[PDB]
């Protein structure tokens, strides 16, 4: 039994067979948010969506940033890209965002209705023959089908390991984005600039010396 | 749990049992227990072969061209450091060469992967259907047309051990090229000449302390 805090009392609601079947169960729920089984099911979906969005977002900031430093690409800072892109764009940001809400809203609604009634989006005749591919799998949050083109989930012996890797990297990506936001305000530089500055002089360039994080000191 | 008759990377040590000696080069070295899971160990065994065989070609492709230039042989590519070959002017632009490379490697690599998933299912020629590899081959060791001289019919166990040993040494050599070129800024054989000129004052300690 792996725990986030060795020797602490694992919450009872995380030790049930249903809870222990979730990926990344390290017994961490000090606020008891997931005590209700229905709520835990909903929060598990929320964590997966945040994990996958954070991973795509952080990869869209870190990889272009590292290539920009190496000179392969020329991409602005993640916090300046929105302005640079819109100047050379074909639409104002208001019309761009509105289209996004319509398109995102449609797919999010279909995912929403599947959470309430799993497999219900396979209702015959609802979609133009494609509903058969929208039933998902037996596990909520792992649709598979057209969402798994390479069929990696079909390998049963590797299924548990794949899920743990996704949630572990997803949790790391979420903290990375929160680090980008905090470091932008604290230092006023880019994430790779912060990394280079720390490596140049680790003992004098960190959050204890940025003049913001520790005001009492 | 490992058999005591098998050779060991650290004589006397107690090594994991899952490295039972079937794979070539099995010296029981796995201090981080990366290969504990049988499913992953199967993949790692192939990945070691692939990285090992490319490293052997790459190392031979970096020393021989430099050795020939030092001897005196003259050809248009002579005298070009392995890390400057990209900028050299060839008959076609580097971008077009890369495009052809990926298309060709997509075919052969997907053929190789098909065998790994279902061994023996990619032994047949798709065009001239008569041609076929022998049915007894194993993943990673095709044989047949890939072994025209029939060396695989001899002491295969020793030959596989020789292959992996040379391969592991080649992989370290290529890692040395990256580190040495990045710190010394010269070709690997030029570094060897400097060391042989004065071995006692040309250690990595001497060199890096000066750059410190």
């Amino acid at each position: 039994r792996q725990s986030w805090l060795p020797g602490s009392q694992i919450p009872a609601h995380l030790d049930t067979p249903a809870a222990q079947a979730l990926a990344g169960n390290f017994g961490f729920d000090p606020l008891g948010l997931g005590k209700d089984p229905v709520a835990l099911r909903w929060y598990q979906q929320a964590e997966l969506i945040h994990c996958r969005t954070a991973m795509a977002g952080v990869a869209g900031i870190l990889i272009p940033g590292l290539l920009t430093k190496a000179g392969a690409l020329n991409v602005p800072e993640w916090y300046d890209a929105g302005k640079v892109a819109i100047e050379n764009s074909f639409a104002p940001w208001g019309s761009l965002l509105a289209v996004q809400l319509f398109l995102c809203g449609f797919v999010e609604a279909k995912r929403w209705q599947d959470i309430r009634k799993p497999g219900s989006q396979g209702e015959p005749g609802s979609f133009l023959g494609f509903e058969a591919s929208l039933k998902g799998t037996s596990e909520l949050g792992y649709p598979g089908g057209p969402f798994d083109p390479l069929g990696l989930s079909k390998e049963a012996d590797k299924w548990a390991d794949w899920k743990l890797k996704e949630v572990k990297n997803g949790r790391l990506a979420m903290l990375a984005f929160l680090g980008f936001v905090a470091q932008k305000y604290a230092t006023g530089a880019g994430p790779v600039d912060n990394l280079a500055a720390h490596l140049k002089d680790p003992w004098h360039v960190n959050y204890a010396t940025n003049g913001v994080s520790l005001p009492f000191l | 749990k490992r058999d005591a008759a098998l050779p060991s990377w650290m004589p006397g040590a107690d090594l994991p049992g899952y490295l039972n000696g079937t794979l070539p080069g099995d010296f029981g070295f796995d201090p981080l227990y990366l290969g504990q899971d049988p499913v992953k160990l199967k993949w790692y065994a192939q990945a070691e072969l692939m990285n090992a065989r490319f490293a052997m070609l790459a190392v031979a492709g970096i020393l021989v061209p430099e050795l020939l230039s030092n001897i005196g042989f003259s050809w248009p590519g002579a005298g070009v450091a392995w890390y400057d070959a990209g900028k050299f002017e060839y008959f076609a632009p580097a971008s077009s060469l890369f495009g052809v490379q990926m298309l060709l490697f997509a075919w052969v690599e997907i053929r190789r992967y098909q065998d790994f998933v279902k061994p023996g299912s990619a032994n047949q020629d798709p065009i001239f259907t008569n041609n076929k590899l022998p049915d007894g081959n194993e993943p990673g060791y095709p044989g047949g047309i890939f072994d025209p001289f029939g060396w695989s019919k001899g002491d295969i166990k020793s030959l596989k051990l020789k292959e992996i040993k040379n391969g592991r040494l080649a992989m370290l050599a290529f890692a040395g090229f990256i580190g040495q070129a990045y710190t010394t800024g010269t070709t690997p054989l030029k570094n060897l000449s400097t060391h042989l000129a004065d071995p006692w004052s040309t250690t990595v300690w001497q060199n890096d302390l000066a750059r410190l």
Partner: protein, 165 residues
């Protein structure tokens, strides 16, 4: 500007008010010596006064004809013209803390009603139990919604006493 107000940074009355307040302190500061404790206290008050008028102007508060800052409470006007930190943002600050206190107290009340003598736990606080609930109250907005959606927040009418009608 909004409702005929003007920014305090551009208000003559606002500037005049600061001069009067500092002038009052300066008059008192004349009767004390430079290094005496009363002089140090008065100057510290003067520094705080100057900082106060500097900060309010920087925050962008609107001033009336009296020269005093006036707050904006409509969410639309506050968000449109950058006054959200006057009423709107403080609104949700309060409701978070207030619900925190209310939710923690409700949890303690429910927890001790399963004890042998519930009334004894209300005059002699179960501090270990109270302390645990206090820390877990940071997530009350999530917990409260789940009870509302689960139908457990409220009691059924058949169990509530009422008078004859």
């Amino acid at each position: 500007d909004i409702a005929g107000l003007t920014p305090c940074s551009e208000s003559k009355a606002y500037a005049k008010l600061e001069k009067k307040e500092l002038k009052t302190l300066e008059k008192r500061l004349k009767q004390y010596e430079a290094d005496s404790a009363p002089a140090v206290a008065l100057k510290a008050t003067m520094e705080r006064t100057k900082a106060r008028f500097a900060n309010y102007a920087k925050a962008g508060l609107l001033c009336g004809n009296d020269g005093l800052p006036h707050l904006i409470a409509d969410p639309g006007l506050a968000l449109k013209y950058g006054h959200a930190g006057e009423v709107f943002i403080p609104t949700f600050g309060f409701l978070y803390v207030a619900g925190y206190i209310g939710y923690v107290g409700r949890q303690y009340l429910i927890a001790v009603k399963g004890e042998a003598k519930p009334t004894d736990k209300e005059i002699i606080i179960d501090v270990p139990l109270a302390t645990k609930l206090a820390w877990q109250g940071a997530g009350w907005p999530l917990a409260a919604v789940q009870e509302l959606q689960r139908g457990t927040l409220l009691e059924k009418e058949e169990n509530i006493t009422v008078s004859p009608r």
